[PDB]
Structures are given as C-alpha cells and as structure tokens.
Design a protein around this ligand. Structure first.
Ligand SMILES: Nc1nc2c(ncn2[C@@H]2O[C@H](COP(=O)(O)OP(=O)(O)O)[C@@H](O)[C@H]2O)c(=O)[nH]1
Length: 150
C-alpha cells in the first residue's frame, strides 16, 4: 500500500497528529489510515530523534524510514517560531526530493493562521493548518495526501 511519513523535530505534535489520522473515518509508529478515499500506511519518525538537534545519526535513521515513502508530511509548529532544526530538516527534505506536504500544527484557532508567514518560504507551498487538540484541518490534509498518491 501507499506509505506516508511524518517528519519533524520533537514536540511539534507528530504523535498527536498520527493518532488523529489513524482514528479518522469518512522507534517508528506505524498505522493504517483508512477512509472512503482508500488506505495508506502512516509512519511517525519522531521516536528516531534522541534530542532536539538534527544530527547525522538521526538523518540516517530518517533516510531508512523514508525509503519507500510516496509522501512526506513535514510537521512544523504552527505557533512557535521556526527553529534551526526546522530549517535543517527543510533543507534535508528538499534534497531528498520526495513530495512534501507542509503541515502546521497546533493551529487551534483560525487566528493563529494569520501568523504562518515564515512557513511559506520553506519551499513547500502553502502550509496546511491543523490542530490535533481541536481536530482541525484533517479533511484538508487527507485530500492533499491523496492528490499525491499515484
Ligand atoms: N495546543 C495543542 N497542543 C498540541 C497539539 N498537538 C499536540 N499538542 C501537544 O504538544 C506537545 C507535543 O505533542 P507531540 O504529539 O507529543 O509531539 P511529537 O514530539 O512531535 O510527537 C504535547 O503536549 C501534545 O499534547 C495541538 O494540536 N494543539
């Protein structure tokens, strides 16, 4: 089946997002997402990081996890400012060349969407705002995922 992988630094909300997507209807964490659009294997790579710094050790682990990935969900905090780790994971993803959907997390209220500007420059297109706490943007995220699964 199709494989979708979540990538991002620690504490941006990857496991929470993973859990919401897994429950959706219509070191790795692996789960089958199934809705009326079809099914795919969702993989969270957060457990591959030891600390919050992008390092060769982690990159090599992420590389393996991305082996047969069709789409990457690049998770960045939608409230906190972008970090050196974010910018480094972004460059790694551009180099990898796999389709990337930029996901802004913890966008609990529409007002937070006004402050996602720095995200548009990461080179991945408009970020899709989500909130696992309020279950926002999951429909839009599933639609984007399926537009890229061949
Ligand atoms: N306010 C808010 N908090 C969230 C949201 N998603 C996750 N969190 C919290 O942010 C912290 C890190 O989330 P987590 O999923 O563990 O991040 P990971 O380390 O990327 O898996 C935890 O306290 C989560 O409960 C969200 O959508 N809104």
């Amino acid at each position: 089946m199709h494989k979708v992988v979540i990538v991002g630094r620690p504490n941006v909300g990857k496991s929470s997002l993973f859990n919401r997507l897994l429950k959706k209807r219509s070191d790795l964490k692996e789960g089958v997402v199934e809705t009326d659009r079809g099914r795919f294997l969702l993989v969270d790579t957060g457990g591959l990081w030891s600390g919050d710094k992008w390092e060769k050790k982690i990159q090599e682990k992420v590389d393996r996890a991305l082996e047969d990935a069709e789409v990457v969900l690049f998770a960045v905090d939608g409230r906190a400012e972008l970090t050196q780790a974010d910018y480094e994971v972004a460059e790694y993803l551009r180099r990898k060349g796999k389709p990337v959907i930029l996901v802004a997390t913890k966008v609990d209220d529409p007002k937070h969407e006004l402050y996602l500007g720095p995200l548009y420059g990461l080179g991945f297109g408009d970020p899709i705002p989500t909130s696992s706490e309020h279950a926002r943007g999951l429909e839009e995220l599933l639609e984007a995922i399926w537009e890229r699964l061949p």
